[PDB]
Design a protein around this ligand. Structure first.
Ligand SMILES: *[C@@H]1O[C@H](CO)[C@@H](O[C@@H]2O[C@H](CO)[C@@H](O)[C@H](O)[C@H]2NC(C)=O)[C@H](O)[C@H]1NC(C)=O
Ligand SMILES: *[C@@H]1O[C@H](CO)[C@@H](O)[C@H](O)[C@H]1NC(C)=O
Ligand SMILES: *[C@@H]1O[C@H](CO)[C@@H](O)[C@H](O)[C@H]1NC(C)=O
Ligand SMILES: [Ca+2]
Ligand SMILES: [Ca+2]
Lengths: 213, 230, 127, 230
């Protein structure tokens, strides 16, 4: 029972689709009796595709064609990284129903691009929560946010500028994905900072923030 | 006899539409027919997915068929034929989705436990008052600190019609927590799922600190030079 | 232990709630509600229009302050769904907000150009 | 003949334990000799106003023996003696008050309507929370000012098992009223009829002002000398 990889195919996206499984070149697919969201939280963690959103045990019309049902049973906690960290004891135990397949709609992961500037290390901030790129707001912006986003950018440390280059690097246009983002200084990236809900902003596009480092 | 439909509880929590009829052990039969037949006539195959485990327990099984298409949401005359040679009359049951029921959003009210109840210092009953929903089926789950509470902690009633309203229903959900949890100020959130809700789920939270206050202390600082808030 | 119930910086109302651990028995601990409201004596009715008349009546619907119309996420067994937190909603702004900078546009004439330049109604807000 | 026993709600609304041997599972036939006999060996004046013939695989003759409260709870095994063509023997079903049930009194809590309900200004739902009672026989009726409201105005849920307690039950009963009636201030008494209460009736009451004073501590700070800092 070695799940090397669990690809997501037959779906609109790279990591939105049905769950497969790979062992010893045999591409196989997984049914499960207890197939919760935490299993998808594992599955879109070992692939590194965002947080897990939806986990449908949704059947389709029978002419799809499908691989057989994976031999072991996979029930675990969900806080772990890969499909090897939790046990898959009952090998050869196929107690799914007749013709069904699972489905995961985990998010595309957080790609963060500093746009509008001459270099990629200096520009207005733009983030990717959904498929649409969008800026973030400067409500209660702090130097902890600057050092967190520069740590995630992999581009050194902030210098805390005098706001003139940030106002000169562009107002931007589009949508504002984040407002009132608040980083504690220790988070690896911008998702793990406290913020208002994605896309719910009380600011216009004139308040798009820029981080210089 | 029973044929439990997928409600909005089974639709939303599990994301799997399972047609289920329960064949109680009236008499032991070898080839128990729990064949879930469509109005079209094709049968999505189910057989003994879980035993009934009734007090008699004489060859009783539950057949759950995953007709998970849009044909249930649109609607069809689905029939499981509980036809048996023992008691030779076929004790079948037919269930369909109820058609054209008007959709009104639930107004969800979270009632804190009574002051009379906390004086006993034994248990606190938090009431989730889901009322005003005209489609009958509703799913109510309690969470504390973002973790789903166990279903033995809370008990939710069947929806019954609201008295003054014509066809709108109401439901309760009584969460029985110990008094030392509620008096320390622990947030108990009522997650309720309904079709007529815009985001499909409403979360009311209650705790002692929000509650009903027993000492408002207001300070209307009328300052000339306020201008911007600080 | 003043948990911040609202921190509305547009009407300046701040509401904070605490359980005062007053007595030994755990019931008579008073749920205390601290409404702190700053009333701008000289701000106009429309803050963004500096020529608006002086705001005299300051009405604060405290239910409108305490509404939470940002949908939150909840974790179900099979899904993460956005969850509405109130039934109220489906803005006067007595005071300016510190984080928000408000600009008004004035007609500036020199030789009849009427170049409409934006001011800063709140200086040291977007500098 | 399935004889429906007189429930405590049925003997409380009428104040007369009218136990009924309604002729169920026996079709319409001749040779009517229906008599309710007490277990000592006698019989009383029985079946006033039996209904007509309804051959929908049953009948409609009703037992109307007006025995007393001291008769029903005495444990006397009352037997109806319906004879018909299908069975020429008195179907002496044993109906009496069972003694195996524990007798724990309800803890009746009367939660006021939520502040959102009065904020919406169309309806207020006062919920009576009858919880912690061992026999599942509770009759809840509401009085406005000492006289009962109509049973259409309130709805009482069936007694359901309290999950943490082993065999105790709970039941919740709302009464949907107008917001303007509750703002005037009325008693809105919830009367709970149950066997284990010391006087068989408890009553709880919520007015518009039913809590603590909620003492206000307003401070119009009308200067910048005492104006706050940040
Ligand atoms: C408050 O004042 C602002 C600024 O004068 C008003 O905004 C302008 O309103 C006019 C008429 O509605 C529009 O033609 C302009 O395009 C607006 N300008 C801006 C920058 O928004 C605003 O309408 C006023 N609000 C109220 C309630 O009086
Ligand atoms: C309410 O009372 C507390 C004392 O417990 C005090 O510190 C606080 O300032 C008061 N609230 C306001 C708004 O003045
Ligand atoms: C409200 O009462 C508290 C004590 O309970 C007191 O400390 C506070 O100063 C009062 N608030 C005023 C006078 O604004
Ligand atoms: Ca903000
Ligand atoms: Ca800002």
């Amino acid at each position: 029972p070695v799940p090397e990889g669990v690809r997501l195919a037959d779906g609109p996206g790279h990591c939105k689709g049905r769950v497969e499984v790979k062992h010893q070149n045999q591409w196989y697919t997984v049914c499960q009796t207890g197939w919760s969201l935490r299993a998808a939280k594992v599955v879109c963690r070992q692939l590194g595709c965002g947080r897990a959103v939806l986990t449908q045990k949704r059947c389709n019309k029978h002419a799809y064609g499908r691989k057989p049902i994976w031999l072991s049973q996979m029930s675990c906690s969900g806080r772990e990284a890969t499909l090897q960290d939790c046990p898959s004891g009952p090998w050869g135990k196929n107690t799914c129903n007749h013709d069904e397949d699972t489905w995961v709609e985990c998010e595309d992961p957080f790609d963060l691009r500093l746009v509008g500037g001459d270099n990629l290390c200096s520009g207005r901030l733009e983030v990717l929560h959904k498929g649409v790129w969008g800026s973030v707001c400067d409500d209660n912006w702090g130097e902890k946010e600057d050092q967190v986003v520069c740590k995630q950018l992999g581009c050194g440390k902030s210098l805390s500028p005098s706001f003139r280059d940030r106002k000169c690097y562009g107002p931007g246009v589009g949508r504002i994905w984040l407002d009132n983002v608040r980083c504690s200084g220790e988070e690896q990236s911008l998702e793990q900072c406290q913020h208002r809900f994605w896309g719910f902003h009380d600011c216009t596009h004139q308040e798009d923030v820029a981080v210089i480092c | 006899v029973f044929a439990i439909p997928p409600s909005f509880a089974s639709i939303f929590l599990t994301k799997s539409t399972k047609l289920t009829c329960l064949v109680t052990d009236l008499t032991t039969y070898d080839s128990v027919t729990i064949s879930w037949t469509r109005q079209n006539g094709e049968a999505v195959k189910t057989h003994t997915n879980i035993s009934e485990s009734h007090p008699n327990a004489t060859f009783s099984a539950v057949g759950e068929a995953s007709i998970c298409e849009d044909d249930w949401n649109s609607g069809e005359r689905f029939t499981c034929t509980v036809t048996h040679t023992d008691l030779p009359s076929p004790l079948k049951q037919t269930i369909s989705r109820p058609k054209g029921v008007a959709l009104h959003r639930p107004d969800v009210y979270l009632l804190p436990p009574a002051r009379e109840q906390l004086n006993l210092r034994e248990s606190a009953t938090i009431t989730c008052l889901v009322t005003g929903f005209s489609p009958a089926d509703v799913f109510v789950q309690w969470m504390q600190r973002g973790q789903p509470l166990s279903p033995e902690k809370y008990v939710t009633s069947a929806p019954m019609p609201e008295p003054q309203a014509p066809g709108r229903y109401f439901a309760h959900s009584i969460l029985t927590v110990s008094e030392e949890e509620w008096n320390t100020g622990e947030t108990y959130t009522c997650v309720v799922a309904h079709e007529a809700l815009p985001n499909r789920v409403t979360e009311r939270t209650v705790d002692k600190s929000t509650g009903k206050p027993t000492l408002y202390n207001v300070s209307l600082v009328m300052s000339d030079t306020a201008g911007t808030c600080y | 232990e003043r948990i911040v119930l609202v921190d509305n910086k547009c009407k300046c109302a701040r509401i904070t709630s605490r359980i005062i651990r007053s007595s030994e028995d755990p019931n008579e601990d008073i749920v205390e509600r601290n409404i702190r409201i700053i009333v701008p004596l000289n701000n106009r009715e429309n803050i963004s229009d500096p020529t608006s008349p002086l705001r005299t009546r300051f009405v604060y619907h405290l239910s409108d302050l305490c509404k939470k119309c940002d949908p939150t996420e909840v974790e179900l067994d099979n899904q993460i769904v956005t969850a509405t937190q109130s039934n109220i909603c489906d803005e006067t702004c007595y005071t300016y907000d510190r984080n928000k900078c408000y600009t008004a546009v004035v007609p500036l004439v020199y030789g009849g150009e009427t170049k409409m330049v934006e001011t800063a109604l709140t200086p040291d807000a977007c500098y």
